[PDB]
Design a protein around this ligand. Structure first.
Ligand SMILES: CCCCCCCCCCCCCCCCCC(=O)OC[C@H](COP(=O)([O-])OCC(O)COP(=O)([O-])OC[C@@H](COC(=O)CCCCCCCCCCCCCCCCC)OC(=O)CCCCCCCCCCCCCCCCC)OC(=O)CCCCCCCCCCCCCCCCC
Ligand SMILES: CCCCCCCCCCCCCCCCCC(=O)OC[C@H](COP(=O)([O-])OCC(O)COP(=O)([O-])OC[C@@H](COC(=O)CCCCCCCCCCCCCCCCC)OC(=O)CCCCCCCCCCCCCCCCC)OC(=O)CCCCCCCCCCCCCCCCC
Ligand SMILES: CCCCCCCCCCCCCCCCC[C@@H](O)O[C@H](CO[C@H](O)CCCCCCCCCCCCCCC)COP(=O)(O)OCC[N+](C)(C)C
Ligand SMILES: CCCCCCCCCCCCCCCCC[C@@H](O)O[C@H](CO[C@H](O)CCCCCCCCCCCCCCC)COP(=O)(O)OCC[N+](C)(C)C
Ligand SMILES: CCCCCCCC/C=C\CCCCCCCC(=O)O[C@H](COC(=O)CCCCCCC/C=C/CCCCCCCC)COP(=O)(O)OCCN
Ligand SMILES: CCCCCCCCCCCC(=O)SCCNC(=O)CCNC(=O)[C@H](O)C(C)(C)COP(=O)(O)O
Lengths: 178, 56, 459, 53, 84, 88, 175, 70
């Protein structure tokens, strides 16, 4: 989610992702914790017997039979965490997420309530105004010629600098705004 | 103030005047369609002692 | 009838003698008063008509259309106030003049005891609409749209004129009362078939008929908000009113000649409702929905039974109000986002809740939720069609299902989901827009209490 | 305007037709007449064309 | 008013594999040469008030005893009253 | 809901609890900043197992791309705090 | 009530059973309807008495309009517009009155169905027969004129029907 | 527990203001109408059907029952 993606997944990453998926689906099949622990230890053992293979062609012929076997026995109704992209409360609270700029449209009678909040908001806005001018130059000088190759951003280098393009990551609404 | 807001609000009176003129013209056009007044077989009515026309 | 015509004419000198910053106020107030005065035409008779003079007469088919026409002008002015802010006083006065002239021509068209006078005013309405579309439209396609909206109309209307004069050369009159009382059957002849076609095609093109509907999406999409409102609410109903008037001389030839138009409308309602499901523009979707509703009205008029005529009148009024409201909602979104692409601005319920309620109620009336007058007309037409042939129920039910589908698709795409992040200029809804929306929607839910006012002369 | 439309006088003659039908049905039920007649006009005053086919 | 009592976690040495089905899982795992490393992470599910279980029929017969006693008292009282 | 507003201290304690209940690590040598690969000698399979244990113990899922680069208990705690928006 | 004619809208004499309490236990319906009477019916009755006295203070009348008979479309020349207008208005009024007659008979039928309860199929044959006769006559008069109906079209339909009847009778006579 | 947080939400001022204005104007005209209607029904009452006396022809507005309709 947070981390920038790469151009490809290496063989180790594919094997680890298959390991996690197979373990989760085995947990879906093996409801009870003791049965799951036994079968998960067996599953880890079955991964471990080819840990030390040196032939890349052999290792790539493997993981392929393995993912085919996974797709055969994948528990068509796996357990999903409620907040996960398949869960029952995945995007439940998106309707409560209001952008921060909407507060700029509030009536002065509305801003009369909560004066400290809006004073701190003004401070944040001033900080953003200055930091942006610094950030544009820093990103222009740090980016390689011909454009970025990976969507990874640099941190601040000097004392008073702020990380480039920070406003919409720092000012997220909330996980559960209401 | 009188004689001052008239020069700024004179236009408002025109629509109302038109409505009155249209009503008057409608009545005047009604006065030209009395060829059968108190003559239809359905409403042949004998005039009241102090009546001139059944309808205007 | 002059007590309504004269004030509408006086709207012009009052507009042109107004202060530079009082034109909208004066126009709105006096147009509302004219609407209130015109509201007294609704006291109709069970007998013939309200025959005011040799020139103008009123009917319980004409009265609802007249009242809707008078009510539409204040809403059009309120909708036009926003996007005409940066424009000179003379040009704004010209725009208001075009709207007033359109209202005057429509008012005289709907009474119009003479068929030639009806044709003259029915074609005189063309000029103000064309000027409004091709002068105060935004995109470069407006000119092209205007051309379509012109020539289609004339392509249908020029033969009618010939037919009309031909009738008066044979009958001796074109007065609607004399025509109705002295009507005679049409023999099955080639000459009579072509007279039937010349009488029908002019009104068919402006409904519009399914095959002849190309001009409508262009004209409604490229027109300004007042133009779209008047096009969808009143100008589409001229064809239905003309057909309802003119089918009295076309019997019994209508029985045979109605089949191609009945098939075209029954299949085209399905086609246009399906087109609405895949539309990337809000205005185009609303225009195609209008085409579907008018296809249903065409079926109703072609069946020519009492229930058909009552349903067609009710549906014409309800569609006018609902489509005007939908266009106004789309324009409120457009004036903020300037794109008119449905997928761009999303999740507007979280930012504009009252406007979301207006969207919901407009979609509900477009969906024909009972006991709205939309469903009253829908059901009357459907029952008449079922009596005409029991197999029409498949097409009618499919149209109902697709209509609900695309109405709720339009609501969900624009109001629900997540807001677009990069759009930060969505300002709170103005009192003008909310007042416009209420002034659209309260008349509908209040007319459902007294349906006989909009069920026509066969009630 | 809504109140004015609500209280519009009965120029459509709904109650008038109801009262006419009420008295007409009362009369025909009392006299044993067969309620509505199938002929809208009296046949004695229509002159059909003799066919002689 | 919320639940602000500064809850402190129990001791981690408290959890043991002994006396749980995790014990026999470990036994069968050792029969083939493997070990379960996350066993103690799950011992709390077999330790406290969760240690004792009830059967399906026992769950169905949740209040059979005192309800049956009420039944027998009621039927005896009715037999005594009607025999009069 | 009635769910207490968990703090950084609770997250740290719970992460260390789950880690001390992993018997391939001796608890006395465990520390918040100890690396998984080198300070404790764990394989990447052990690391993904630890991520699964954290997920099952906090009730939410860490995506593979973020999970595969979490190598210290402290940064696991930091990731959980950022996801759950913990103040102190 | 006197507000409507009992002959146009008849009702059976409304036989009701008498309460026969076989047990001494108090039925809550009686006490509950008595307290309803006390708490609801009396205040409503008193308000109605007030309103009725106020109405009696100001008494005025309205009249049912009488329409003369005029020659119908049969006594009209082929192009005499005035007599055709009179006849058309009379025919439209008669059509409305016939619609109201059918409405009255349908109301009778609905009331019978609800009133006779579980034995409506036998105890509503009278209303069904009346509605069948009235429906047949109304259909014979106005079934197929469509929109744009008139007295002339109704007369043409009647002439066609009675030509068919005359042909059928002549065929039966010469059988 | 003093953990009260600020709730970010759009301005409800304009929607409430519009609703208050619409309610005020609709009531401004409808309350006198409702009171007058009730007063008219209560004291004026309604016309009762009667037979037309011989030699008397009624006015066109004397064929209606409700006083407001008349
Ligand atoms: C059911 C009985 C009701 C009796 C009470 C009287 C109610 C009078 C309402 C009159 C019409 C409302 C005006 C429309 C604009 C709404 C104004 C507004 O913005 O609200 C601000 C106000 C303040 O809220 P807020 O917090 O400031 O705003 C936050 C957001 O706006 C968020 O706001 P929200 O989320 O709360 O949504 C606003 C609300 C309101 O918005 C709407 O959607 C209302 C319009 C829905 C109709 C859609 C068209 C379909 C055709 C129906 C035609 C019926 C009209 C009948 C005659 C009406 C006369 C004018 O929408 C809904 O809640 C969805 C309701 C869906 C109802 C669908 C069922 C329809 C048929 C029901 C039966 C009708 C015939 C019965 C026959 C047998 C019985 C006699 O909210 C309200 O007051 C709610 C309005 C009342 C709810 C209406 C639901 C039923 C009423 C139906 C019409 C009258 C029935 C007559 C029968 C009586 C017996
Ligand atoms: C310890 C206790 C001691 C004391 C005990 C005694 C006292 C207490 C207990 C005893 C009393 C118990 C209760 C007695 C009840 C009657 C007593 C009484 O006072 O009778 C007086 C009087 C007596 O009746 P009457 O003279 O013997 O009868 C003659 C007929 O009523 C002549 O008919 P009409 O033509 O006058 O009828 C007009 C009609 C309708 O009025 C209209 O047509 C007005 C049309 C206006 C349309 C446009 C409105 C404005 C635009 C709105 C836009 C919104 C956005 O009025 C109504 O609709 C009344 C409805 C009654 C409903 C009753 C329940 C029905 C339930 C059915 C369903 C059940 C299942 C659900 O009746 C009335 O005064 C009726 C008043 C109606 C007021 C209508 C107001 C309309 C307002 C229009 C504008 C609205 C704008 C919005 C704001 C409006 C203001 C809120
Ligand atoms: C916010 C939450 C709710 C708060 C408010 C609560 C109160 C709700 C009550 C209102 C809605 C409930 C429905 C109950 C209706 C009661 C009134 C109704 O019964 O009166 C109607 C009367 O109203 C009218 O029929 C309908 C109004 C007409 C609408 C005209 C539109 C206004 C002009 C605007 C311009 C036109 C634009 C559209 C062009 C076509 C029908 O009465 P009717 O039995 O029949 O005869 C009237 C009385 N008689 C017997 C003496 C004749
Ligand atoms: C494109 C988008 C929509 C635009 C509008 C479309 C609607 C227009 C459809 C026109 C309605 C019907 C036209 C003619 C109907 C007559 C009945 C005919 O179809 O049936 C047969 C007619 O037979 C043949 O059709 C004869 C004519 C053959 C030539 C016609 C060309 C065929 C295709 C042309 C269609 C192109 C339409 C657009 C033109 C630009 C019956 O033969 P018969 O019983 O003996 O004679 C009946 C007529 N009488 C009684 C008067 C003598
Ligand atoms: C949206 C674009 C549509 C374009 C127009 C579509 C409508 C076409 C209708 C026909 C146009 C002209 C018809 C004439 C007008 C009525 C006059 C009339 O009925 O008189 C007829 C005259 O009939 C005609 O002359 C008809 C000739 C038509 C010539 C033009 C043909 C146009 C194209 C024909 C094919 C398409 C027809 C239907 C198209 C529908 C629209 C798509 C009989 O009178 P007499 O001859 O004097 O008496 C009989 C004894 N002598
Ligand atoms: C119940 C649902 C269906 C289940 C069926 C699925 C069947 C899967 C079993 C297939 C067997 C395999 O492992 S498929 C064999 C894939 N190839 C290799 O294992 C070669 C080298 N191994 C690695 O590189 C690993 O990453 C490793 C070194 C272990 C960790 O690395 P870290 O040190 O970087 O953590």
């Amino acid at each position: 989610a947070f981390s920038a993606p790469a151009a490809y997944l290496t063989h180790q990453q594919k094997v680890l992702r298959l390991y996690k998926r197979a373990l989760r689906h085995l947990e879906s099949w093996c409801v009870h914790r003791d049965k799951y622990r036994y079968f998960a230890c067996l599953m880890r053992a079955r991964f471990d017997e080819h840990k030390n293979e040196k032939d890349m062609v052999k290792a790539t012929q493997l993981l392929r039979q393995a993912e085919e076997e996974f797709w055969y026995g994948q528990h068509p109704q796996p357990y999903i965490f409620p907040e996960s992209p398949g869960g029952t409360s995945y995007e439940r609270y998106e309707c409560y997420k209001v952008p921060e700029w909407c507060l700029d449209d509030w009536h002065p009678s509305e801003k009369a309530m909560y004066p400290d909040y809006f004073a701190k908001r003004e401070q944040w806005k001033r900080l953003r105004r200055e930091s942006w001018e610094r950030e544009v130059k820093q990103l222009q000088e740090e980016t390689p010629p011909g454009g970025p190759r990976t969507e990874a951003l640099p941190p601040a280098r000097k004392e008073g600098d702020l990380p480039p393009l920070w406003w919409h990551i720092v000012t997220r609404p909330r996980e559960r705004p209401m | 103030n009188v004689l001052q807001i008239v020069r700024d609000h004179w236009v408002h009176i025109l629509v109302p005047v038109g409505f009155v003129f249209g009503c008057y013209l409608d009545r005047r056009s009604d006065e030209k369609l009395t060829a059968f007044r108190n003559k239809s077989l359905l409403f042949k009515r004998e005039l009241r002692p102090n009546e001139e026309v059944t309808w205007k | 009838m002059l007590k309504i015509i004269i004030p509408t004419t006086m709207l012009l000198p009052m507009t042109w003698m107004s202060k530079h910053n009082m034109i909208w106020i004066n126009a709105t107030v006096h147009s509302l008063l004219i609407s209130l005065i015109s509201l007294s035409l609704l006291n109709q008779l069970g007998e013939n008509s309200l025959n005011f003079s040799l020139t103008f007469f009123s009917d319980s088919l004409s009265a609802p259309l007249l009242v809707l026409t008078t009510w539409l002008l204040p809403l059009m002015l309120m909708a036009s106030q926003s996007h005409l802010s940066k424009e000179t006083t003379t040009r704004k006065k010209l725009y208001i003049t075009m709207l007033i002239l359109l209202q005057l021509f429509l008012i005289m068209t709907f009474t119009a005891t003479e068929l030639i006078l009806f044709y003259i005013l029915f074609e005189a309405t063309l000029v103000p609409t064309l000027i409004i579309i091709t002068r105060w439209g935004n995109q470069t396609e407006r000119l092209n749209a205007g051309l379509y909206f012109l020539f289609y109309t004339l392509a249908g209307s020029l033969p009618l004129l010939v037919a009309l004069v031909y009738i008066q050369n044979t009958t001796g009159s074109l007065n609607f009362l004399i025509i109705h009382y002295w009507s005679h059957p049409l023999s099955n002849s080639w000459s009579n078939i072509f007279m039937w076609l010349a009488c029908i095609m002019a009104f068919m093109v402006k409904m519009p008929l399914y095959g002849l509907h190309l001009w409508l999406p262009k004209a409604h999409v490229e027109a300004p908000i007042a133009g779209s409102m008047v096009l969808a609410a009143v100008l589409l109903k001229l064809g239905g009113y003309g057909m309802m008037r003119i089918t009295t001389i076309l019997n019994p030839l209508t029985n045979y000649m109605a089949y191609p138009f009945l098939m075209l409308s029954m299949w085209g309602m399905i086609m246009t409702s399906s087109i609405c499901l895949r539309q990337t523009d809000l205005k185009s979707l609303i225009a195609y929905s209008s085409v579907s509703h008018m296809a249903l009205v065409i079926v109703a008029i072609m069946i020519q039974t009492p229930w058909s005529f009552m349903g067609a009148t009710a549906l014409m009024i309800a569609h006018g109000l609902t489509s005007s409201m939908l266009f106004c909602l789309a324009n409120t979104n457009y004036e903020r986002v300037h794109s008119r692409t449905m997928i761009l601005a999303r999740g507007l319920q979280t930012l504009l809740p009252l406007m979301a309620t207006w969207w919901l109620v407009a979609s509900l009336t477009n969906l024909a939720l009972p006991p709205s007058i939309n469903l009253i007309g829908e059901l009357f037409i459907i029952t008449a069609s079922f009596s005409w042939s029991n197999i029409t129920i498949i097409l009618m039910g499919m149209n109902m299902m697709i209509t609900a589908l695309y109405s709720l698709y339009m609501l969900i795409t624009t109001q629900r989901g997540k807001y677009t992040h990069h759009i930060n200029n969505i300002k709170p809804s103005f009192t003008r827009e909310n007042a416009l929306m209420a002034l659209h929607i309260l008349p509908l839910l209040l007319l459902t209490l007294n349906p006989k006012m909009i069920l026509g002369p066969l009630y | 305007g809504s109140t004015f439309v609500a209280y519009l006088p009965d120029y459509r003659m709904q109650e008038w037709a109801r009262r006419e039908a009420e008295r007409l049905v009362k009369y025909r039920e009392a006299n044993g007449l067969p309620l509505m007649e199938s002929n809208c006009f009296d046949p004695n005053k229509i002159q059909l064309p003799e066919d002689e086919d | 008013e919320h639940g602000h009592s500064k809850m402190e976690l129990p001791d981690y040495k408290q959890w043991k594999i002994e006396g749980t089905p995790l014990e026999t899982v470990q036994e069968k795992l050792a029969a083939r040469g493997l070990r379960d490393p996350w066993g103690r992470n799950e011992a709390w599910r077999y330790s406290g008030g969760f240690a004792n279980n009830v059967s399906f029929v026992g769950a169905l017969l949740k209040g059979f005893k005192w309800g049956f006693a009420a039944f027998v008292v009621a039927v005896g009282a009715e037999y005594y009253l009607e025999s009069q | 809901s009635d769910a207490p507003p968990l703090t950084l201290e609770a997250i740290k304690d719970r992460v260390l609890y789950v880690l001390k209940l992993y018997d391939k690590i001796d608890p006395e040598k465990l520390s918040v900043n100890s690396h998984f690969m080198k300070d404790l000698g764990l394989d990447s399979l052990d690391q993904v197992e630890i991520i699964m244990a954290m997920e099952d113990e906090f009730g939410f899922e860490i995506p593979d791309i973020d999970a595969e680069k979490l190598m210290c208990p402290q940064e696991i705690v930091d990731y959980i705090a950022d996801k759950k928006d913990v103040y102190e | 009530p006197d507000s409507w004619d009992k002959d146009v809208y008849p009702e059976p004499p409304r036989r009701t059973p008498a309460p026969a309490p076989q047990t001494s236990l108090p039925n809550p319906v009686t006490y509950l309807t008595k307290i309803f009477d006390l708490l609801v019916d009396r205040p409503v009755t008193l308000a109605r008495e007030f309103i009725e006295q106020q109405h009696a203070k100001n008494r005025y009348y309205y009249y049912h309009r009488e329409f003369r008979r005029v020659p119908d479309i049969t006594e009209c020349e082929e192009k005499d517009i005035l007599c055709m207008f009179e006849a058309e208005m009379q025919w439209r009024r008669d059509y409305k009155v016939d619609q109201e007659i059918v409405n009255i008979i349908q109301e009778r039928l609905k009331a019978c169905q609800q009133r006779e309860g579980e034995s409506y199929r036998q105890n509503c044959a009278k209303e069904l027969e009346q509605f069948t006769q009235v429906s047949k006559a109304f259909q014979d008069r106005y079934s197929d004129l469509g929109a744009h109906y008139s007295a002339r079209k109704c007369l043409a339909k009647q002439k066609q029907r009675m030509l068919a009847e005359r042909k059928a009778a002549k065929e039966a006579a010469a059988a | 527990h003093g953990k009260r947080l600020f709730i970010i939400k759009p301005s409800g001022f304009y929607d409430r203001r519009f609703l208050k204005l619409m309610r005020f104007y609709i009531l401004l005209t409808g309350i006198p109408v409702a009171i007058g209607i009730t007063l008219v029904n209560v004291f004026i009452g309604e016309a009762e059907l009667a037979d037309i006396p011989e030699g008397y022809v009624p006015e066109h507005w004397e064929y209606f029952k409700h006083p407001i309709s008349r």
